[PDB]
Write a protein that binds this ligand. Structure first.
Ligand SMILES: NC(=O)c1ccc[n+]([C@@H]2O[C@H](COP(=O)([O-])OP(=O)([O-])OC[C@H]3O[C@@H](n4cnc5c(N)[nH+]cnc54)[C@H](O)[C@@H]3O)[C@@H](O)[C@H]2O)c1
Ligand SMILES: NC(=O)c1ccc[n+]([C@@H]2O[C@H](COP(=O)([O-])OP(=O)([O-])OC[C@H]3O[C@@H](n4cnc5c(N)[nH+]cnc54)[C@H](O)[C@@H]3O)[C@@H](O)[C@H]2O)c1
Ligand SMILES: [Zn+2]
Ligand SMILES: [Zn+2]
Ligand SMILES: [Zn+2]
Ligand SMILES: [Zn+2]
Lengths: 374, 374
């Protein structure tokens, strides 16, 4: 029996910015009313977790990061109706409370209960379930998956198919759904269109998958790391360009390549300059540019609003525009029905104890997704 | 009689920025192949014409400005098929060539033959039909309606109903169509939604008209000139706010008023700060903000891209997103069938010879549209 008891387990604690994760024993309190304690099975390394280490994505420290994961329900608090002990689950770093104006809106998904806009690093009730060396440790996006056990609010967890392979479908918790939805739900890429995708990591490859599923005729991958090009072509890029190879700015190159601008562009990096470049390279009268990358804390971009007055559309989205709790079980069912592939995103599978090695693979340009296994 | 001959007539020539128009004799060449010479009957004063005087909308000087007008065809050049002498016409400041990628696109209207993006101040053939004091004078947006006679390319004119009242339907050539289309075609305002309209001049009032036609439940007019409020309520504003009345920035006021941000916001002024404020006041997950104002030449705004990443859509449009030559005749037919009103926009009527008085009325805040009659 662990139910109703404090669990002592292993977690990766980030005590301060720009330091390795500390793998050590934490205490995980039992779930309170409407909370779920999960035994983690697999978690991916997303660039957003690295941005917490870099300090470009601000959230209270010390913290248990990790938000792209899957595991099995260990216990439920009073009042929980949507999952049961032994269920396979994906934590939802964007919650779906079902009650707020956004959850009720046909097109909104950025639930007002999210912990991304103004991060507190707590449970919904403003407290933490984690202690380490006698110190309270913050949560991250209501998920905190870099731990053998986490506690999540019910609105931050989805039940998934009992037969799903958790070492793959953890990517539906972030990278796959974010990129794929950015193309199919947020941009609504059209058949025969020309798309430009800036950044060919796990999220950008998932954007390419979505553009190809939507029947784009041309998908131009843009990355400064030419080692990313082969995999981008495998999942649907028709051509790849490295801005470092050109004397002209890449917006000019992409405008000429697309005979006056692309139909859809996607920023999947998190730099202010590429967000402006991505907007500029879409057709000035009817182009659509989607910001997917997380921009650096408290920094403003500079842009000429004439880019919008001619007719461009600029938008961004969290988690691919998916209503998280409705969508994640459906995406897992679609994966089980072979409607899309996740293996092309997975370059490395490491034990959890090698989390730091996994982060160094990402930082060095050598990995797409490392999956950590508990 | 005048067919094939130079016409000497009076025009309002702008010789230099920040000076009154000079009403004096010009020579108007006869139309070349696929050109149409028009006897002007009525023209409106749009803030964009004033921005030419201010130098914030840059176009080559000296120039004959004016782009919101209606008149009667005097003659047609060789090969013209879409109008005849004696037809009532509205010049199209956004052309519709019908051949370019934009014209063929289901959404696009900003035809690649436009003279707004990189203004030359010519006919399509890169030459001028106007001489004054023996000096060639620039055209403006292919229309140049501040003249008793103008010459336009055929792709820059539409035939309208022979019975239409030209002293009213001239507004379909800019202000009404631009504001009304921004709401009904660009934003696609929904029934029961909350809109905010920044700037309550001729184009903002037309945005309100369009929000009311689309069935918005709340239309919040925003202007620093409270004299604009009464007419905004007459055409559908449910409430008006003056930012100068508040201690807090108006995006915060509008967010409070709309219990978390508006469905649709429109910047109909032409200022960088209000373009950012109008984006901020739309709901962060599903809000839509439309730029209608013409921003000051070559100036960039600064904004935080987190405003978009949460889910906002930001876009702009010229001429309300209408394909100009398809749309203008239909808009006149709908006016003739009492589907919308133009009189609320018309505050003042003057003879063409009092054009400077007409610009003084706009600059003082006193007018919405002054209609000049030739
Ligand atoms: N919107 C969301 O919900 C969401 C969730 C997941 C990820 N994120 C963000 O999405 C971005 C991509 O995440 P990821 O795929 O895990 O990251 P990643 O795997 O590091 O991929 C980034 C790619 O960008 C490339 N790159 C870096 N700089 C440039 C440049 N100047 N020009 C062209 N290419 C460049 C880089 O070589 C790499 O292949 C990051 O900012 C994440 O924080 C957002
Ligand atoms: N997109 C297009 O196709 C298109 C064509 C027509 C007009 N325009 C532009 O649209 C804008 C409006 O044109 P218009 O209606 O003729 O102009 P207008 O009659 O001058 O209306 C503008 C309104 O903005 C108000 N205003 C000025 N500054 C502020 C402020 N800081 N905060 C709130 N209100 C303010 C002002 O009091 C006025 O009532 C101008 O920038 C035009 O150049 C664009
Ligand atoms: Zn919610
Ligand atoms: Zn992520
Ligand atoms: Zn065209
Ligand atoms: Zn105008």
């Amino acid at each position: 029996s662990t139910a109703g008891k404090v669990i002592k387990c292993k977690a990766a604690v980030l005590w301060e910015e720009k330091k390795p994760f500390s793998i050590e024993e934490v205490e995980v309190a039992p779930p309170k009313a409407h909370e779920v304690r999960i035994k983690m099975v697999a978690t991916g390394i997303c660039r957003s977790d690295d941005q917490v280490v870099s300090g470009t994505l601000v959230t209270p420290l010390p913290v248990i990061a990790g938000h792209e994961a899957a595991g099995i329900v260990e216990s439920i608090g009073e009042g929980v109706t949507t999952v049961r002990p032994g269920d396979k689950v994906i934590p939802l770093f964007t919650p779906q409370c079902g009650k707020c104006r956004v959850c009720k809106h046909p097109e909104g998904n950025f639930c007002l209960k999210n912990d991304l806009s103004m991060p507190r690093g707590t449970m919904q009730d403003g407290t933490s379930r984690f202690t380490c060396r006698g110190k309270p440790i913050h949560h991250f996006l209501g998920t905190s998956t870099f731990s053998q056990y986490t506690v999540v609010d019910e609105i931050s967890v989805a039940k998934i198919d009992a037969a799903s392979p958790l070492e793959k479908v953890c990517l539906i918790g972030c990278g796959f759904s974010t990129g794929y939805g950015s193309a199919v739900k947020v941009a609504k890429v059209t058949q025969g269109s020309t798309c430009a995708v800036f950044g060919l990591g796990g999220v950008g490859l998932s954007v390419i998958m979505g553009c190809k599923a939507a029947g784009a005729a041309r998908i131009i991958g843009v990355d400064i790391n030419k080692d990313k090009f082969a995999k981008a072509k495998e999942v649907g890029a028709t051509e790849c360009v490295n801005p470092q190879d050109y004397k002209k700015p890449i917006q000019e190159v992409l405008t000429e390549m697309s005979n006056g601008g692309v139909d859809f562009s996607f920023e999947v990096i998190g730099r202010l300059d590429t967000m402006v470049t991505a907007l500029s390279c879409c057709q000035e009268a009817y182009g659509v540019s989607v910001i997917v990358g997380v921009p650096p804390d408290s920094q403003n971009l500079s842009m000429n609003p004439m880019l919008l007055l001619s007719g461009r559309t600029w938008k961004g989205a969290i988690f691919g525009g998916f209503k998280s709790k409705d969508s994640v079980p459906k995406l897992v069912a679609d994966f089980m029905a072979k409607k899309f592939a996740l293996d092309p995103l997975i370059t490395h599978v490491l034990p959890f104890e090698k989390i730091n090695e996994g982060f160094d693979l990402l930082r060095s340009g050598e990995s797409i997704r490392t999956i950590l296994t508990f």
